[PDB]
Enzyme design. Structure first.
Site, mmCIF file in Angstrom:
data_model
loop_
_atom_site.group_PDB
_atom_site.id
_atom_site.type_symbol
_atom_site.label_atom_id
_atom_site.label_comp_id
_atom_site.label_asym_id
_atom_site.label_seq_id
_atom_site.Cartn_x
_atom_site.Cartn_y
_atom_site.Cartn_z
ATOM 1 N N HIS A 158 0.834 -1.203 0.000
ATOM 2 C CA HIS A 158 0.000 0.000 0.000
ATOM 3 C C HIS A 158 0.868 1.253 0.000
ATOM 4 O O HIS A 158 0.650 2.178 -0.796
ATOM 5 C CB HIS A 158 -0.925 -0.011 1.224
ATOM 6 C CG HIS A 158 -1.914 1.113 1.271
ATOM 7 N ND1 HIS A 158 -1.580 2.421 1.574
ATOM 8 C CD2 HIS A 158 -3.257 1.106 1.081
ATOM 9 C CE1 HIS A 158 -2.674 3.170 1.545
ATOM 10 N NE2 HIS A 158 -3.700 2.398 1.243
ATOM 11 N N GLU A 198 1.320 3.934 -3.344
ATOM 12 C CA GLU A 198 1.045 5.363 -3.259
ATOM 13 C C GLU A 198 2.275 6.190 -3.620
ATOM 14 O O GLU A 198 2.181 7.155 -4.389
ATOM 15 C CB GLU A 198 0.557 5.706 -1.858
ATOM 16 C CG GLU A 198 0.328 7.171 -1.609
ATOM 17 C CD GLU A 198 -0.844 7.737 -2.412
ATOM 18 O OE1 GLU A 198 -1.784 6.956 -2.790
ATOM 19 O OE2 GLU A 198 -0.795 8.976 -2.657
ATOM 20 N N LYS A 220 2.877 6.090 -7.430
ATOM 21 C CA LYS A 220 1.938 6.910 -8.193
ATOM 22 C C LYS A 220 2.376 8.367 -8.199
ATOM 23 O O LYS A 220 2.370 9.030 -9.241
ATOM 24 C CB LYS A 220 0.519 6.757 -7.638
ATOM 25 C CG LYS A 220 -0.078 5.412 -7.982
ATOM 26 C CD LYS A 220 -1.551 5.361 -7.636
ATOM 27 C CE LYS A 220 -1.766 5.383 -6.152
ATOM 28 N NZ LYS A 220 -3.239 5.286 -5.885
ATOM 29 N N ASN A 221 2.747 8.894 -7.035
ATOM 30 C CA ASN A 221 3.193 10.273 -6.961
ATOM 31 C C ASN A 221 4.490 10.490 -7.737
ATOM 32 O O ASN A 221 4.633 11.483 -8.453
ATOM 33 C CB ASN A 221 3.357 10.666 -5.501
ATOM 34 C CG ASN A 221 2.039 10.878 -4.816
ATOM 35 O OD1 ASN A 221 1.373 11.888 -5.045
ATOM 36 N ND2 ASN A 221 1.688 9.980 -3.934
HETATM 37 O O1 P35 Z 1 5.135 16.673 -4.517
HETATM 38 S S1 P35 Z 1 6.066 15.852 -5.293
HETATM 39 O O2 P35 Z 1 7.402 16.392 -5.392
HETATM 40 C C1 P35 Z 1 6.021 14.303 -4.668
HETATM 41 C C2 P35 Z 1 5.237 13.937 -3.582
HETATM 42 C C3 P35 Z 1 5.186 12.694 -3.049
HETATM 43 C C4 P35 Z 1 5.992 11.665 -3.555
HETATM 44 O O3 P35 Z 1 5.950 10.409 -3.026
HETATM 45 C C5 P35 Z 1 6.827 11.959 -4.623
HETATM 46 C C6 P35 Z 1 6.847 13.241 -5.179
HETATM 47 O O4 P35 Z 1 7.666 13.546 -6.228
HETATM 48 N N1 P35 Z 1 5.557 15.756 -6.840
HETATM 49 C C7 P35 Z 1 4.307 15.059 -7.134
HETATM 50 C C8 P35 Z 1 3.802 15.659 -8.374
HETATM 51 C C9 P35 Z 1 2.720 15.344 -9.208
HETATM 52 C C10 P35 Z 1 2.487 16.121 -10.325
HETATM 53 C C11 P35 Z 1 3.276 17.213 -10.660
HETATM 54 N N2 P35 Z 1 3.001 17.999 -11.805
HETATM 55 C C12 P35 Z 1 3.658 19.241 -12.125
HETATM 56 C C13 P35 Z 1 2.751 20.125 -12.976
HETATM 57 C C14 P35 Z 1 3.450 21.401 -13.408
HETATM 58 N N3 P35 Z 1 4.773 21.178 -14.051
HETATM 59 C C15 P35 Z 1 5.673 20.280 -13.247
HETATM 60 C C16 P35 Z 1 4.972 18.995 -12.817
HETATM 61 C C17 P35 Z 1 4.351 17.527 -9.846
HETATM 62 C C18 P35 Z 1 4.598 16.771 -8.727
HETATM 63 C C19 P35 Z 1 5.687 16.896 -7.713
#
Ligand code: P35
Ligand code: P35
Lengths: 338, 338
Positions: free
Chosen positions: B219, B223, B226-227
């Site tokens: 889990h 998650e 995905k991020n």
């Molecule tokens: O917050 S985060 O760094 C992050 C958090 C958790 C985790 O486990 C890992 C991570 O990297 N990250 C997630 C995410 C999702 C979408 C976007 N889109 C943006 C839109 C505009 N142009 C630039 C890209 C950017 C980010 C940045």
């Protein structure tokens, strides 16, 4: 001819400190005088009121009483200027002399308070309630002190902008701190890890610069290099090849981030908090320098591999605002799992 | 034929939950029954008492009232067993049926509580005092719930050790979570970053295994992938070459640490806290799973470059002890800068 100090402390502790931005510092002597003869008493009185909330055990120690006595005299020193004429050149020169005397008086505050903590532990034994209060207080006391030193240094240096470099080259400060830490590591271990720097200037793939106080940045990086070098050498006693210390300097829209990565074997998560505990104040004071202009300093280890340390700074001088403790109900009040 | 629920809640909330270690879980049906007909009421009652400390505004929402009503019925369901004979096979089979019914009843607790939060914001507007209380409460409520589900799943699965794998291959779980996240990323973006795994087994340079509940580890990693994947693809809209996601699995003396590193451009430090704020509960609930057996989940970004996420787990089953909230004075009570 002055009133008793408690009357001044009560008066000035009613006011809140006034936080300045790096831009404001960066951007007259009579104005500085009339500002500081209010603002330095406000800052001195606010933290003196918090000292009084410490546990009796801590307040009873001779070294805490000594520091308190310095703060009292410094406050009274400034009260001598309340009725003096800013138009008189002699007022201004005497004021600068008085601030120099205050700075010298307080030069040894950090180790003198630490001796107070040791006196409390030796005299009474420590207990978790007092220890939590001490930790909360010392973060605020030492940040308050950093802010008072900043105000005094700016005035005395001006009358670079004082201690501020409007075009601080971050990698140059990294290298200076590395060089000095390497001298120490080489002395004791006859070897030290190499340095690798990478810059990530996200919007302008241009050397990274900022408005900052270089001595503060140097202080933080020097402490981090000492720890990273010691970890690397001591975890590699059977190797002639040492992994380098890798530094990344990243410039984003809001943050200027500096990561220091070592392969020194790390530390278990359980022990990370202790590194910022006063109960060698290098790491907690370094983190206060980062917090002082709305930044932070964070540590993340992988036990068995190594540690990353990150200095978070504000990229913009308008976001770089003093972080000042204030004596109020929330502060006063501040003094569930199985 | 049962007493009113408040009489049971008051009775069982006086007891503290009893945390079990992973070793204890790993290491009879009548004993499980007699344990759980005390322990599940204790855990249900302790958190039901905390629900009652929520602000009136939150407690007044229909979805919070609904969840409360489920907890009441589940408590009463177990009270039916207080005078039943463990020696009677029918008691044991009826008990397992009752636990299955409770688990199904509570299947949708997480989104139903989230609807309660939305109802509070829509009906009254949010305010920082309530929001801080909600954040404190929901961490404890959802961890409590994780612990109740663990107890029920262990009993129903046993009567792997229940849901526990005594030889969980961490990299295999990483790969499973990556595979599933890649299916989703490929669906929406027609591309996804590759995976690179490195293991650091400090004492035995041997594949890394542990005693853990693989579904919980999956889990968390799903998650995080995905991020990291979304960040990587969305920050590289003009590139066909995507930087990989790099995972390090480190085994130390006390910690088993899993770092996921991306080059997705990161996020400013100011916005990190929001990622764990309930006010998409994927990240806060993942961190609760890590905390449940004395671990943690931490995020560190470099704005302009990327983000590291670290899952900290205890390496040893004897250190892997349930982290359970308890209703007591400290909890009740829990409900200064310029
Ligand atoms: O917050 S985060 O760094 C992050 C958090 C958790 C985790 O486990 C890992 C991570 O990297 N990250 C997630 C995410 C999702 C979408 C976007 N889109 C943006 C839109 C505009 N142009 C630039 C890209 C950017 C980010 C940045
Ligand atoms: O805590 S740390 O990870 C750390 C903290 C801060 C920081 O900025 C950077 C860091 O790496 N680190 C410092 C240090 C110093 C000495 C040793 N000696 C050990 C003795 C026994 N054999 C193994 C080596 C280990 C470590 C580990």
């Amino acid at each position: 001819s002055l009133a008793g100090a408690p009357k001044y402390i009560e008066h000035f502790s009613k006011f809140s400190p006034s936080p300045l931005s790096m831009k404001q510092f960066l951007d007259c002597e009579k104005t500085s005088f009339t500002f500081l003869r209010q603002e330095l008493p406000v800052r001195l009185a606010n933290i003196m009121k918090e000292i009084n909330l410490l546990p009796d055990r801590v307040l009873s120690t001779p070294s805490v009483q000594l520091v308190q006595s310095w703060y009292v005299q410094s406050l009274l020193d400034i009260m001598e200027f309340l009725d003096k004429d800013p138009e008189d050149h002699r007022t201004l020169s005497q004021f600068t002399d008085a601030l120099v005397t205050i700075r010298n008086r307080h030069n040894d505050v950090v180790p003198t308070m630490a001796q107070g903590v040791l006196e409390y532990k030796d005299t009474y034994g420590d207990d978790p309630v007092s220890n939590q209060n001490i930790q909360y207080f010392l973060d605020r006391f030492y940040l308050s002190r950093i802010s008072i030193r900043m105000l005094i240094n700016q005035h005395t240096l001006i009358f670079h902008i004082g201690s501020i470099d409007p075009n601080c080259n971050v990698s140059e400060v990294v290298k200076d701190a590395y060089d000095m830490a390497k001298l120490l590591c080489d002395k004791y271990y006859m070897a030290s890890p190499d340095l690798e720097i990478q810059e990530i200037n996200a919007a302008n793939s241009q050397p990274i610069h900022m408005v900052y106080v270089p001595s503060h940045l140097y202080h933080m990086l020097f402490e981090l290099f000492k720890n990273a070098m010691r970890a690397t050498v001591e975890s590699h006693e059977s190797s002639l090849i040492l992994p380098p210390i890798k530094v990344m300097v990243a410039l984003g829209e809001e943050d200027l981030s500096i990561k220091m990565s070592d392969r020194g074997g790390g530390v278990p998560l359980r022990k990370i908090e202790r590194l910022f505990s006063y109960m060698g104040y290098g790491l907690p004071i370094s983190r206060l320098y980062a917090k002082y202009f709305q930044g932070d300093l964070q540590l993340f280890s992988m036990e068995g591999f190594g540690t990353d340390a990150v200095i978070y700074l504000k990229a913009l001088s308008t976001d770089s605002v003093e972080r000042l403790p204030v004596y109020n109900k929330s502060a006063w009040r501040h003094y569930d799992w199985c």
